[PDB]
Structures are given as C-alpha cells and as structure tokens.
Amino acid sequence: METLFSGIQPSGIPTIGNYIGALKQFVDVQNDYDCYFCIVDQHAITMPQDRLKLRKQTRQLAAIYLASGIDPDKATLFIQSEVPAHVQAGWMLTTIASVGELERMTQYEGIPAGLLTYPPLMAADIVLYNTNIVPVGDDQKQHIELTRNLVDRFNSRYNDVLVKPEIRMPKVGGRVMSLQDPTRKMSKSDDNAKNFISLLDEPNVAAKKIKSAVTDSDGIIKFDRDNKPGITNLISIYAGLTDMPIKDIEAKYEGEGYGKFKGDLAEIVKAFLVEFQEKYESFYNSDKLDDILDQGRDKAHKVSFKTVKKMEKAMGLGRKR
Amino acid sequence: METLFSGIQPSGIPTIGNYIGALKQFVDVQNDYDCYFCIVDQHAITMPQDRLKLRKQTRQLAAIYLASGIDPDKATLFIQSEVPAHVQAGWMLTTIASVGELERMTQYEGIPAGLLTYPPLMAADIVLYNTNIVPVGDDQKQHIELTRNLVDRFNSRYNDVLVKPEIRMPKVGGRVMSLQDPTRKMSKSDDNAKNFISLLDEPNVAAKKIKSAVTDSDGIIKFDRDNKPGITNLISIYAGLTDMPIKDIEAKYEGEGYGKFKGDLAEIVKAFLVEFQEKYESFYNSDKLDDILDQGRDKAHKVSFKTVKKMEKAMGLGRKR
Numbered sequence: 097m098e099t100l101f102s103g104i105q106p107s108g109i110p111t112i113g114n115y116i117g118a119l120k121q122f123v124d125v126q127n128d129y130d131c132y133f134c135i136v137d138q139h140a141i142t143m144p145q146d147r148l149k150l151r152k153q154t155r156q157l158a159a160i161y162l163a164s165g166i167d168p169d170k171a172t173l174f175i176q177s178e179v180p181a182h183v184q185a186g187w188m189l190t191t192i193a194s195v196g197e198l199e200r201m202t203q204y205e206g207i208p209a210g211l212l213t214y215p216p217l218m219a220a221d222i223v224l225y226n227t228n229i230v231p232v233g234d235d236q237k238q239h240i241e242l243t244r245n246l247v248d249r250f251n252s253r254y255n256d257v258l259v260k261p262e263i264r265m266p267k268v269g270g271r272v273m274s275l276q277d278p279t280r281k282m283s284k285s286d287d288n289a290k291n292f293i294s295l296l297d298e299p300n301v302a303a304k305k306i307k308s309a310v311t312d313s314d315g316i317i318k319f320d321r322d323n324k325p326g327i328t329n330l331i332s333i334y335a336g337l338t339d340m341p342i343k344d345i346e347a348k349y350e351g352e353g354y355g356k357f358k359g360d361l362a363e364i365v366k367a368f369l370v371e372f373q374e375k376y377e378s379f380y381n382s383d384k385l386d387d388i389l390d391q392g393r394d395k396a397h398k399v400s401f402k403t404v405k406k407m408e409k410a411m412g413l414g415r416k417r
Numbered sequence: 418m419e420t421l422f423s424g425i426q427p428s429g430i431p432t433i434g435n436y437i438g439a440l441k442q443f444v445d446v447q448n449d450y451d452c453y454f455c456i457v458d459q460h461a462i463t464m465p466q467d468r469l470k471l472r473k474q475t476r477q478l479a480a481i482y483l484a485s486g487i488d489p490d491k492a493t494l495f496i497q498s499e500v501p502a503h504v505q506a507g508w509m510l511t512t513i514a515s516v517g518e519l520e521r522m523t524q525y526e527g528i529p530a531g532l533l534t535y536p537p538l539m540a541a542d543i544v545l546y547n548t549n550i551v552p553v554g555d556d557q558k559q560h561i562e563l564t565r566n567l568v569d570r571f572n573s574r575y576n577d578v579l580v581k582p583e584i585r586m587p588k589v590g591g592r593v594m595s596l597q598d599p600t601r602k603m604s605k606s607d608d609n610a611k612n613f614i615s616l617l618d619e620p621n622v623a624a625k626k627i628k629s630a631v632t633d634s635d636g637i638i639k640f641d642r643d644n645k646p647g648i649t650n651l652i653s654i655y656a657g658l659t660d661m662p663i664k665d666i667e668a669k670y671e672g673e674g675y676g677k678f679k680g681d682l683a684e685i686v687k688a689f690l691v692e693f694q695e696k697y698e699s700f701y702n703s704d705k706l707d708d709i710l711d712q713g714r715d716k717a718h719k720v721s722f723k724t725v726k727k728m729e730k731a732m733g734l735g736r737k738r
C-alpha cells in the first residue's frame with residue numbers, strides 16, 4: 097500500500113473549490129492509500145502571524161478535515177509542531193543542502209530567514225513517513241525536486257534510509273473556478289468575496305453567491321468550457337457536490353433555462369453547507385477534538401521517530417545505545 | 418544562583434591548555450553556578466563529518482569532561498541532539514531572524530546551508546535554560562549579540578519569555594601558549610604536534626613535549642612574558658597543574674636552572690596525564706557512561722521543555738490543552 101503525505105497550511109478556510117478538488121477525493125483515497133494529513137504550523141510562522149489567529153485556524157482546519165470525512169483511524173491527521181521529528185529531520189537535511197539551492201527556491205526589518213530555510217523542513221515533512229506520493233500542483237515542483245535531490249544526497253553520502261517521493265494525486269477532482277471570473281481558479285483569499293464560496297460561509301450567503309455568479313442571462317445546461325465557462329463552472333460545482341455525472345446533468349435539465357438550474361444549485365449548495373457546518377461545529381466545539389489530534393500525533397510520532405533514528409545513526413548524531 | 422551554559426564541539430580532543438584555561442575552572446564554578454555543558458553534535462554536522470568519527474568523539478568528550486571532575490549531579494552534562502527543544506526553539510528563532518543578519522554572521526557542491534543557519538540554533542541552545550552567562554571568547558561576540566537581539570525581538574513581538582545572556586567566564590584560568598611558538602595560543606589542531614599537549618597524548622610523549630618546548634638554553638625561573646615568553650609559558654603550565662602560586666614557584670626555584678625546572682615539570686605533566694587518563698578510560702569504557710548521559714539528557718529536557726512550551730504558546734504554535 098502506497099503512503100501519501102499532504103501538508104495543510106493553517107492560513108485560511110478552504111473553499112468549496114478545495115472541497116471538490118481535493119478534500120472529497122481524500123475521503124475516498126484514504127481507504128486505498130496510507131494517508132498523512134499534517135497541519136504545518138511550523139511552516140505558517142515563516143510568515144508573520146497573529147498568535148491567536150494561528151492557533152484558532154489550526155483547530156479550524158482540523159475540524160474541517162474531520163467534517164469532510166477524513167477519518168482519524170484510516171488516516172493520520174496531526175499538527176506538525178507536536179511531532180519533533182519534523183524539525184529534527186529538517187535540521188539534518190539543512191546541513192546537506194546548499195545556500196545556492198535554497199536561494200533558487202526563493203526565486204521560482206529584512207527578509208525573514210524562515211522564507212529561505214523552510215524547503216528542507218518541507219522535505220523532512222515528507223520523507224519522515226517513507227512517503228511515496230504527494231498530491232501537489234505545478235507550483236510545488238521545485239520543492240519536490242529539492243526533496244528528491246536531498247534524498248539522493250543523503251542516501252549517497254551516508255547510507256540508504258530515505259525514500260524518494262513523486263507528485264501524484266490519486267483521484268483528481270473537478271476544477272472549480274471563481275464565480276465572477278470563470279477563467280481563474282477559485283481562491284480562499286480573493287478581494288472579491290463573491291468569487292469564492294468558503295466552507296464556513298453562511299449557507300444563505302453561499303446560495304446568494306451561486307445566484308450572483310457571472311453567466312449569460314439564459315442558455316441551455318450544456319458543458320462547454322471554451323464558450324460558456326460561466327455556466328460550465330456552475331455545472332462542475334453541481335457535479336462536485338452531488339456526484340451526478342455531467343452528461344446526466346445535461347439530460348436532467350434538457351429543456352430548462354438558467355433560472356431553474358441556478359435555483360436548484362443554490363439550494364444544493366445551501367443544503368451541503370448546512371450539513372457540513374453542523375459536523376464542523378460538532379468537532380470544533382468538542383473535547384473529543386483534542387483526543388483525536390492527540391491520537392493522530394501519537395500515530396505520526398511512532399513512524400517518524402523510527403525514521404529520525406535511522407537518520408541520526410547514519411550521520412553519527414547522538415549515541416549508540 | 419546564576420545559570421551558565423557552555424557549548425562543547427565534539428570535533429577534537431581538548432589540550433592541557435583547554436584544561437588549565439577552562440575545564441579546571443568549571444570544576445570549581447559548578448558549585449556556585451547552575452551549569453549546563455552541552456555537546457553540540459547538531460552543530461558539528463554543519464561541517465562535513467565522518468559519522469563514526471563524530472559519534473566516537475562525542476563519547477570521548479563526555480568522558481573527558483567527567484574525568485576532569487565535571488559532576489553530573491552538580492551540573493548538567495548532555496548531548497544536544499538528545500534534547501529536541503534545541504531544534505524546536507532554533508526553528509522558532511530562525512523565523513524571526515533576517516537573511517541579512519545571518520549572512521553578516523558568515524562574514525565576521527556549494528556552501529552548506531548549515532553554515533548560514535546555525536546561529537539561531539546557537540541562540541536556542543543558550544536561552545532554552547534561561548542562561549545568564551556564557552563563557553566564550555572574542556570570536557563569539559557577534560553570536561551573543563545576535564542571541565540578545567533575538568531575545569529582544571521575541572519578547573517584544575510576542576511577550577516576555579526569554580532571558581538575555583552575557584559573555585562571562587566566572588573564574589578565568591591561565592592562558593597557555595603553543596610550546597614551540599609562545600606568542601600563539603595553544604590549539605588542538607596545530608600542524609606542529611609538538612606545539613600542544615593533548616589530554617589524550619601518551620604521558621611519555623607529553624613529557625617529551627615539555628622538554629622540546631622552545632626556550633633559552635638556560636635562565637632563572639622568573640615570570641616575564643614580554644622577554645621570556647617561553648619559560649614564562651612553562652611556568653604557567655606548572656602553576657596550572659599544581660595550583661602553586663607563581664611567586665611561590667619563583668621562590669622554590671631560586672638558584673635553579675632550566676634543566677631542573679623542565680625536568681620537574683615534564684614529570685608533573687606525565688603524572689597528571691596518567692591520573693587523568695585512568696579516570697578517562699574508566700568512564701569511556703563503562704556502561705555507567707550511558708547512564709550518566711541519560712540522566713543529563715533528562716535533566717536538560719525537563720527545563721528546556723518548559724521553555725519551548727512558553728515559546729510555542731507565545732507564537733501560537735500547536736494547541737491550548
């Protein structure tokens with residue numbers, strides 16, 4: 097069984113685009129892959145953070161992953177800073193990186209040193225669990241290249257302990273676009289809040305965002321990205337939240353106009369968020385949330401500890417006991 | 418009671434200069450100060466190392482400190498990599514350092530990133546124990562300036578948890594010079610091995626190095642650094658290993674020439690090393706050595722854990738449990 101590792105930034109609420117594109121897919125793929133979901137709070141502080149904003153966002157993310165169906169027994173959901181092997185292995189990989197290498201990553205009061213030195217910590221986050229696949233996008237290519245190059249450098253200079261990972265998302269979800277700019281991907285941090293639908297938006301606000309999404313005044317419910325990216329995007333969201341095949345959507349709405357379809361979809365979005373947010377409140381406001389995160393941390397520590405120990409033996413850190 | 422922290426590089430055997438200058442003094446000052454002696458193996462790998470050479474040197478250093486009289490109950494002798502708070506607090510301080518700052522430290526395959534990014538780890542090594550004093554020399558000034566500046570930056574941006582340290586050696590020992598270059602300090606890494614006397618030199622080899630030390634052919638046993646740095650240096654070693662006051666040395670050897678004095682001193686050096694190396698073998702070849710280092714690690718972990726936790730709460734890492 098292949099091991100998957102996904103880093104999660106506690107820096108914002110995922111949108112419904114992120115749910116359809118990734119989270120919903122993770123809820124399936126956790127049965128067929130050994131999955132790690134790591135809330136990378138030590139990466140979040142490479143940037144300036146309010147300390148209450150950061151600690152709250154970390155709980156929020158954990159509650160959202162659990163609300164989506166990420167299962168603490170099937171997968172390992174934990175907080176990066178609670179597992180010390182991450183900064184231990186990150187320091188070891190830092191000593192074999194080069195300054196030139198780290199600088200080129202930054203390209204693809206002063207400048208915080210975290211922004212230069214975080215890539216080896218990302219490498220560590222991955223290889224500590226013998227990861228085979230990382231579900232990232234084009235923007236993370238140079239990071240994985242550095243990771244694989246460091247695994248090569250380590251195994252070559254000391255001895256084979258580390259595994260090279262690949263970029264692979266096992267079941268890619270649909271691509272969800274901004275509601276009022278259908279050529280751009282939906283983003284949690286848009287200045288036009290009508291562009292996205294946050295997982296924590298009020299369900300009635302989200303229904304309004306479906307109605308205000310930029311489309312023709314009317315048309316047929318047909319999937320055509322090149323010529324009608326607006327309605328096509330909406331059909332993608334419909335498909336994403338109901339699992340109805342797209343061709344099966346077209347047939348349900350044959351002879352229907354936009355008003356009927358946007359009305360049904362806004363209701364579908366509202367219904368989804370009401371069910372999602374009840375689960376989310378229930379995890380977020382519960383004592384069991386700390387129990388779950390405790391157990392996740394213990395799972396990850398058991399695996400990552402063995403790896404750190406092999407690494408320390410390979411470089412000659414510590415003692416032979 | 419003031420807390421003292423001394424980093425120890427596992428990169429070479431201390432010389433008798435290092436014993437007279439520092440180690441012997443630490444054996445006294447550990448009664449009057451809360452002392453931490455930390456074998457910084459995570460700093461040693463910033464440079465290229467053979468992994469067996471490094472792990473052996475680490476045991477050797479611990480055995481030498483114990484052989485000198487460093488007392489595992491009075492002081493805390495441990496190995497840096499066995500206490501995870503060091504790289505945890507080092508990462509936190511890294512995120513508030515600036516690249517410019519770290520670069521200027523480097524001034525005062527490529528260039529290993531460890532050589533750029535180690536100073537915040539040094540800062541962490543110190544402040545984790547609420548250190549008041551660090552017994553370092555001129556070459557470490559910019560490192561302590563960075564440390565104090567990071568303590569200021571941390572306490573100012575989040576809230577007061579960290580203590581500013583000072584450079585202070587509570588009882589400075591004598592200065593011991595190279596035996597065949599009396600104007601340079603004695604160094605463990607000289608290309609002229611007659612220049613130093615290693616604590617692990619064969620006692621008969623060391624006696625020969627006393628005889629081969631570069632002096633006038635004869636003279637009076639008088640302390641005069643400007644005009645007779647050779648014999649004066651030797652008198653310093655004599656004073657350092659026997660605790661005889663220097664004026665009291667001059668009076669013992671009034672009416673004596675160099676041959677008598679160098680003969681007595683070579684015997685004194687031989688006698689000291691025989692007693693030292695028996696203790697050293699006895700710790701180095703013992704199962705109790707791992708027990709001692711275990712207990713040291715547990716002592717340091719208890720203090721440094723509380724500090725790391727205050728730091729994580731201050732930046733908003735982790736969870737409030």
Ligand SMILES: C[C@H]1c2c[nH]c3cccc(c23)S[C@H]1C(=O)O
Nearest residue numbers: 101102103104105136139218221
């Ligand atoms: C969250 C970040 C991160 C830190 N460690 C990891 C490990 C795997 C994937 C990612 C990460 S994804 C990456 C990003 O920049 O999105």
Ligand SMILES: C[C@H]1c2c[nH]c3cccc(c23)S[C@H]1C(=O)O
Nearest residue numbers: 422423424425426457460539542
């Ligand atoms: C061993 C080095 C080191 C790492 N952490 C610390 C903490 C205090 C003093 C020192 C150190 S002394 C320094 C040196 O360069 O000698």
